[PDB]
């Protein structure tokens, strides 16, 4: 079921938005 | 394990174990208690290692978790985390065995084929393992950390 992953993953998506960062060469 | 490897070489040469082979077994069994401790620490902190490494990975590669990206969507994101958890469990097995035989059969041979079909990018799975190393290493004593590091590095090499 990956239930722990399902709740943790949405928690992660809500806390931070990846759709702006853009890749950094670093 | 160390045992399996030693025995297999001896059997192939149809001989009893060398003094060198015996010595390696002795050293390994002395290290056993320490190895079990390292594994236990990582097992306990599993959820943290995966999650913090996951966060770093998503920061490092925003694209994967983007509408265009493969990992996009919560279900997909969960699967990527599930994968990280699987790889962490494998590492612990390696540490207690003292070799990669368990790791290799379960997680690296045929790995190229599977991810390529899925279209998940491997030139990034390795990065996730690197990430996991950094987190895991911070929960270990310096000597313990080095031991653990080797196994993490092997995974990165194998991909």
């Amino acid at each position: 079921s990956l239930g722990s992953w399902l709740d943790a993953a949405r928690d992660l998506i809500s806390q931070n938005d990846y759709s702006q960062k853009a890749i950094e060469v670093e | 394990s160390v045992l399996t490897k030693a025995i297999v070489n001896a059997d192939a040469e149809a001989r009893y174990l060398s003094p060198g082979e015996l010595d390696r077994i002795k050293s390994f069994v002395a290290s056993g208690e320490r190895r079990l401790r390292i594994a236990q620490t990582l097992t306990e902190a599993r959820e943290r290692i995966v999650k913090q490494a996951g966060d770093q990975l998503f920061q490092k590669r925003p694209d994967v978790v983007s509408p265009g990206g493969n990992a996009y969507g919560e279900k997909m994101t969960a699967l990527c985390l599930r994968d990280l958890d699987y790889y962490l469990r494998l590492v612990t097995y390696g540490i207690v065995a003292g070799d990669v035989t368990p790791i290799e059969e379960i997680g690296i041979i045929g790995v190229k084929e599977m991810y390529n079909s899925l279209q998940t990018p491997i030139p990034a799975v390795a990065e996730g393992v690197r990430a996991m190393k950094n987190v895991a290493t911070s929960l270990l004593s310096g000597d313990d950390a080095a031991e653990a590091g080797f196994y993490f590095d092997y995974l990165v090499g194998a991909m």
Binding site: - | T4, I7, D11, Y16, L17, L22, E33, Q40, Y93, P102
Partner: protein, 161 residues
């Protein structure tokens, strides 16, 4: 093949479980035994030829097998029999270090009965020879080691029969 450590790992991997304290305890048990096993193995390797000679004297030689019309009659057959004895001893030693009987099944035991039947090698006598080796080995290794050593010899004997 499989060893004690890998056997625990494999059992947990099919469950998908991370390694737990109960599992750790089984692993820990092997690690204490290990030092003793290594000492036993060195004893056996050094005395291997003697062990086989004593065991043959106890069971195989001075018998009908050695006498004409017996399976161990002719130099070629005598030599083959003591070669097989050496195999059994070597593999039992490997199993004792490993702490697992799997290697015996994978290499020694697999196909042995069928081969023996075609050859005409008598299984009962072979088993007798293995049991004889065990007793001799028991003496050399010492009591603590002997218990561990005995189970692998017994495993071979049961497989053959």
């Amino acid at each position: 093949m499989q060893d004690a450590i890998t056997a625990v790992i494999n059992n947990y991997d099919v469950q998908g479980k991370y390694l737990d304290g109960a599992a750790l305890d089984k692993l820990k048990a092997y690690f204490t035994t290990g030092a003793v096993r290594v000492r036993a193995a060195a004893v056996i390797s050094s005395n291997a030829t003697t062990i086989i000679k004593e065991a043959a004297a106890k069971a195989l030689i001075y018998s009908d097998l050695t006498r004409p019309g017996g399976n161990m009659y002719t130099t070629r057959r005598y030599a083959a029999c003591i070669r097989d004895m050496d195999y059994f001893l070597r593999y039992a030693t490997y199993a004792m270090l490993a702490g697992d009987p799997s290697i015996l099944d994978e290499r020694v035991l697999n196909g042995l009965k069928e081969t023996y039947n075609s050859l005409g090698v008598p299984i009962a006598a072979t088993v007798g020879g293995i049991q004889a080796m065990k007793e001799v080995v028991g003496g050399l290794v010492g009591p603590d080691a002997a218990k561990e050593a005995s189970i692998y010899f017994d495993y071979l004997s049961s497989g053959l029969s």
